[PDB]
Amino acid sequence: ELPTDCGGPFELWEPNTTFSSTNFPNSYPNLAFCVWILNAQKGKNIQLHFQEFDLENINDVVEIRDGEEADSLLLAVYTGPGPVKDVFSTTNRMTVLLITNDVLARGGFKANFTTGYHLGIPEPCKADHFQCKNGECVPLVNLCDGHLHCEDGSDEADCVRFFNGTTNNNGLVRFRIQSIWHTACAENWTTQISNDVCQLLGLGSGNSSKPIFPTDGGPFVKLNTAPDGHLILTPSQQCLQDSLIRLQCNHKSCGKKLAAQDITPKIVGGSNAKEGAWPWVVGLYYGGRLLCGASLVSSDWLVSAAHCVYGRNLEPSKWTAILGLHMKSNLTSPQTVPRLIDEIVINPHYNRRRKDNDIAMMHLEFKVNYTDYIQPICLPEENQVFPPGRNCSIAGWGTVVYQGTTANILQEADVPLLSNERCQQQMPEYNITENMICAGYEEGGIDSCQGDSGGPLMCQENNRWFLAGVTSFGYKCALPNRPGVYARVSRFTEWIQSFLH
Ligand SMILES: *[C@@H]1O[C@H](CO)[C@@H](O)[C@H](O)[C@H]1NC(C)=O
Ligand SMILES: *[C@@H]1O[C@H](CO)[C@@H](O)[C@H](O)[C@H]1NC(C)=O
Ligand SMILES: *[C@@H]1O[C@H](CO)[C@@H](O)[C@H](O)[C@H]1NC(C)=O
Ligand SMILES: *[C@@H]1O[C@H](CO)[C@@H](O)[C@H](O)[C@H]1NC(C)=O
Ligand SMILES: *[C@@H]1O[C@H](CO)[C@@H](O)[C@H](O)[C@H]1NC(C)=O
Ligand SMILES: *[C@@H]1O[C@H](CO)[C@@H](O)[C@H](O)[C@H]1NC(C)=O
Ligand SMILES: *[C@@H]1O[C@H](CO)[C@@H](O)[C@H](O)[C@H]1NC(C)=O
Ligand SMILES: *[C@@H]1O[C@H](CO)[C@@H](O)[C@H](O)[C@H]1NC(C)=O
Ligand SMILES: *[C@@H]1O[C@H](CO)[C@@H](O)[C@H](O)[C@H]1NC(C)=O
């Protein structure tokens, strides 16, 4: 008997600034979903400063968005008591959604925004410097010089990239020094430095190099070796019968298992996974309780579902990432590696009401070494399509019922892929967007459940296990004709690669 109230302060202009929920110094109504659209002038952002904030737990949240149109962004998801940071917008419209539960009504929030030109983002400094990602600017002599100057490392990042590359794993060797880009030569190019250059680019070893001729007027730089392991770029423009380096680099540690497994046919009735059969499956415990799994994509980064970390991102220290998790009742094994979380980044295009863009990055506390039972998952390459009917394996600790006991050992099962058209024909309730992929049997039996959220949809391709899905939502478990819908990682590859660097 508590319906969502409609008719609150939707449109808020410039003089009308000091807004708040209904009866702010009191208890707000439960099951309320209110929206405070913050209109502004064309060319001014929104700066919201919460004067007093004391909400309920993760059950009730305040979601701040910067939509301005049908496709809404995501700025912050605040919850819990205590002061919060001032959200800095980028457009003239900000949506403040108040998601509430049915019980435990807390006090409420109150804020006063302000419209200005590029608020939050600091003013750009003099043009003779290079601005980092945090707004601070450093002199041009301090970028790409082998010494970290930016707080995040923007001066020493993206100092070399592929040029004239037919694929994302080869091309030229254009370096950047003193804020100018230029190619290299092949007079003294060996194999001992090729793998080093490939590692600097964020790739594997060097396959081969095909120097032909120079075609650009850039001041190509000579490259030599060094006994201390430093790629020296001798500043000079003088070379006879030169040639641009067409360097070919291999991929990084991809989805290659290192355990000694056997062959066992199990399609219908998938049993437990052997110790070390899925090294890129990471567990996430929030206060001594597994909620949603994660996929190891780098040495310190994890990809998890955005619906379980929704509201639990304010305090990343409460999470605990268990790498090499095999049994839920025995963590004293030498293969289990515990780590903490220090940063949780939710996808900007996430939408809990549409279950779209369900993906989230989680930074680890300390970097973890790769072992025989811990290996990173392999991100799918750009412009890669997975055909339907492809039997891809999954992994997780799903429970047979909502409030029962889950499997102690890691469970795994193979499910075939489905097209979006047939999936929508099978699920007339939900909404299947162009960033989702459905997989599962229409006859039931092999179906995911709670506890497998964020689990990877591992599809093997040329002896390599890629990442073709992240668990987003699903209907009731143990029901036929209800395939699991996962977030299509192929559409979020660049968003993850922008953070892995
Ligand atoms: C603020 O809102 C009230 C009603 O919500 C409206 O009458 C008024 O014109 C708005 N602007 C002000 C007070 O500057
Ligand atoms: C909100 O609180 C008061 C307004 O009474 C003001 O001093 C403060 O600067 C405001 N913060 C903003 C507008 O971000
Ligand atoms: C290679 O680089 C040259 C620059 O001189 C450019 O004109 C050309 O389009 C690039 N690609 C190919 C395939 O030649
Ligand atoms: C480059 O290659 C030539 C070829 O003999 C060699 O004499 C020279 O020592 C190498 N290094 C430099 C810096 O020229
Ligand atoms: C290099 O590329 C080829 C494909 O042409 C591949 O077979 C090989 O494994 C790669 N690595 C090495 C070291 O040859
Ligand atoms: C947990 O694993 C260790 C090492 O594998 C083993 O010694 C211990 O007996 C296990 N715990 C239980 C309850 O079996
Ligand atoms: C991981 O690799 C580093 C690099 O040498 C090493 O110092 C460390 O002992 C290794 N093991 C762990 C648990 O960090
Ligand atoms: C999936 O498994 C079934 C079981 O017989 C098989 O017929 C089908 O070919 C498999 N799909 C792929 C892509 O291997
Ligand atoms: C999602 O909902 C819209 C209505 O806003 C509808 O037009 C669309 O067909 C739905 N998506 C699917 C896959 O049916």
Residue numbers in the entry: 519 to 1019
What sentences appear in the manuscript?
Since the SEA domain has been shown to be dispensable for the enzymatic activity, a further truncated hEP including only residues 182–1019, i.e., also leaving out the SEA domain, was used for further high-resolution structural analysis. The resulting purified hEP was a heavily glycosylated single-chain zymogen with a molecular weight (>130 kDa) higher than that theoretically predicted of the amino acids alone (95 kDa). An enzymatic activity assay performed in vitro confirmed its inactive state with no detectable substrate cleavage as previously described, and the hEP became active upon cleavage by trypsin into two chains. Cryo-EM single-particle analysis of this inactive hEP yielded a cryo-EM reconstruction at 3.8 Å resolution, with the resolution of the core region reaching 2.7 Å, allowing explicit visualization of side-chain density of most residues except for those of surface loops L1, L2, and LD in the peptidase domain. The overall architecture of this inactive hEP was the same as that containing the SEA domain (residues 48–1019), showing a clamp shape adopted by the heavy chain with the light chain in the center. The LDLR, CUB, and MAM (LCM) domains were observed to protrude from the remainder of the hEP-core region, which containing the CUB2, LDLR2, and SRCR domains of the heavy chain and the peptidase domain of the light chain, resulting in lower local resolution likely due to high flexibility of the LCM relative to the core region. In addition to the disulfide bond (Cys772-Cys896) between the light and heavy chains, the CUB2 and SRCR domains stabilized the peptidase domain by forming hydrogen bonds between Glu581 and Arg871, and between Ser771 and Gln893. The CUB2 and SRCR domains were interconnected by the LDLR2 domain, and clamped the peptidase domain with a total interaction surface of 1163.2 Å2. Additional density for glycans was observed at all nine N-glycosylation sites in the inactive hEP-core region, suggesting a near-physiological state of our inactive hEP structure.
